[PDB]
């Protein structure tokens, strides 16, 4: 009389400890392969008074190629995988499966654009821990890559029509979410640290910073952006500044596949039947979630 049944499981991409583990890990990889020559961080005490802390250590420049990694289950636990089409990232998943390790990942620290990640199978998908709350970040997962090549000549090249179609489809998916009669507009960052304002990323150890204004100025040939390689930056691992050594080889290049975006929607509390979206990012944890949203580690019971 016993009935056979599939095991339904509940996922929450916004509360996945795999994210914190990866975050801790990428930090460990960097602390052992991309150490700063000088590091300045805030050193405080109870009362609330702080003095700057400075650390000087060896900072050897090294050639850096992408090493594919993945997370596997320790004896005793299993990794669940949601296979649902257009899975939201939270709620129960009907067609789930198990894997020993997650798919191979080529992690990239960046902002505004997600580089070299996994693409969506069907159409574009957008996910947020809460679309109504405008303080929460919107992760856009593309289903079609948009290549972007950069040169040491401070400029990255991006296909304009390719990229304009992308904003078109991204915009279309936002409507399905915020309303089919609402007006979708893309505006540049509202400001903050240079890491937040520009599209910044690390390619082979070098820290690039590109003006992204041309990418987020849109209403519903190539696109060359002004880029810069910096030696002095603000850290993504902790609050503080770091200084790295200059580049080794004269010409520094970089080829990356744009696979997603980090957006925010302006809290347009005012009645207007229009929504504004700007480049987001900053917490590298959202970069980790965009790849781990379909997994959930659990105990074998």
């Amino acid at each position: 009389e016993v009935k056979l049944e599939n095991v339904t499981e509940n996922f929450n991409m916004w509360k996945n400890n795999m994210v914190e583990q990866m975050h801790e890990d990428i930090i460990s990889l960097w602390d052992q392969s991309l150490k700063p020559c000088v590091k300045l961080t805030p050193l405080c005490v109870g009362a609330g008074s702080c003095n700057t802390s400075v650390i000087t250590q060896a900072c050897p420049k090294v050639s850096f190629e992408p090493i594919p990694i993945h997370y596997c289950a320790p004896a005793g636990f299993a990794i669940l995988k949601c296979n649902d089409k257009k899975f939201n990232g939270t709620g129960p998943c009907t067609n789930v499966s198990t894997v020993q390790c997650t798919h191979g990942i080529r992690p990239v620290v960046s902002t505004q654009l997600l580089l070299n990640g996994s693409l969506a199978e069907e159409e574009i998908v957008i996910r947020s821990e809460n679309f109504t709350n405008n303080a929460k970040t919107i992760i856009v997962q593309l289903n079609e890559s948009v290549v972007i090549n950069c040169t040491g000549a401070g400029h990255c090249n991006l296909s304009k029509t390719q990229w304009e179609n992308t904003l078109e489809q991204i915009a279309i998916k936002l409507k399905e979410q915020f309303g089919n009669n609402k007006t979708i507009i893309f505006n540049p960052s509202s400001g903050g640290d240079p890491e937040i304002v520009t599209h910044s990323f690390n390619c082979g150890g070098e820290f690039f910073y590109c003006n992204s204004t041309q990418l987020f100025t849109w209403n519903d040939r190539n696109i060359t952006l002004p880029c810069r390689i910096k030696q002095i930056i603000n850290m993504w691992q902790e609050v503080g500044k770091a200084m790295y050594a200059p580049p080794i080889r004269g010409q520094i290049r970089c080829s990356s596949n744009i696979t997603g975006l980090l957006l925010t929607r302006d809290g347009g509390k005012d009645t207007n039947g229009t929504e504004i979206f700007r480049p987001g990012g900053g917490d590298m944890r959202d970069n980790w979630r965009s790849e781990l949203y379909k997994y959930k580690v659990v105990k074998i019971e």
Partner: antibody, heavy 127, light 110 residues
Framework: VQLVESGAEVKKPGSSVKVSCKAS????????FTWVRQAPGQGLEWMGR????????HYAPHLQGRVTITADKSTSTVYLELRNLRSDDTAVYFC?????????????????????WGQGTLVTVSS | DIVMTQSPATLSVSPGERATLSCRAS??????LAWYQQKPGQAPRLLIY???TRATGVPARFSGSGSGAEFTLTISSLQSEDFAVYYC???????????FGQGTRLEIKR
């Protein structure tokens, strides 16, 4: 790009001296500055260097926290402080600096050589 | 502690002739090697840096050469203004603990 230092000094043992180096001619924060000493009849001695834009100074070990290198972005002036002076601290102190690039835009060469030099300041320590 | 050794301590050479100064590092320093000239009662002057790159305003008779832990400074035609003391300096280590050579005094042969 000019570097000018304050006049000679005669100090009493155990006292402190603070030499200054007024830089001018270009963007102060785009240079790093070094202090070099040379005792009478002796060679050059590297004392330390400050990464101005970052406001961080590094020093030569055997100085045991008696020296402090500081900069004042407001007046484009670098300073060398030496404490609890001893007779053998008597020497000419040289101030120097080099262009590092667009530090203010985040670029930095971290060049360790010395292109521009002050005139030197004589410091005599004796009772 | 990276030690820089210069040889010989004193070099005598006739004017108009060629001089060649030696500098050795106790260990590798790559190319972060500079050369300075200093006349008595004056501040040092930068001549070469990056082992072979010659600073601006420095005669072409002055040429730098070397790599690793062995460097050389060459002056093809000694002029009166070239007779002084020369120092080499390394700035390759980090944390920075830069150091100078003891010096090589260039004097006139008569």
């Amino acid at each position: 790009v000019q570097l000018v230092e304050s006049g000679a000094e005669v100090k009493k043992p155990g006292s402190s001296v603070k030499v200054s180096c007024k830089a001018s001619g270009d963007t102060f924060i785009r240079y790093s500055f070094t202090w070099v000493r040379q005792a009478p009849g002796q060679g050059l001695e590297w004392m330390g260097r400050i990464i101005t834009i970052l406001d961080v100074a590094h020093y030569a070990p055997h100085l045991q926290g008696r020296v402090t290198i500081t900069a004042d972005k407001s007046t484009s002036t670098v300073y060398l402080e030496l404490r609890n002076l001893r007779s053998d601290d008597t020497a000419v102190y040289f101030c120097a600096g080099v262009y590092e690039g667009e530090a203010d835009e985040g670029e930095y060469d971290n060049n360790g050589f010395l292109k521009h030099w002050g005139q030197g300041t004589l410091v005599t320590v004796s009772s | 502690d990276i030690v820089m050794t210069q040889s010989p301590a004193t070099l005598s050479v006739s004017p108009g002739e060629r001089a060649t100064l030696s500098c050795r590092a106790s260990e590798s320093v790559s190319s972060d090697l500079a050369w300075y000239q200093q006349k008595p009662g004056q501040a040092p002057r930068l001549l070469i840096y990056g082992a072979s790159t010659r600073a601006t305003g420095v005669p072409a008779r002055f040429s730098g050469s070397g790599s690793g832990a062995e460097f050389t400074l060459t002056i093809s035609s000694l002029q009166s203004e070239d007779f002084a003391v020369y120092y080499c300096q390394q700035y390759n280590n980090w944390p920075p603990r830069y150091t100078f050579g003891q010096g090589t005094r260039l004097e006139i042969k008569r």
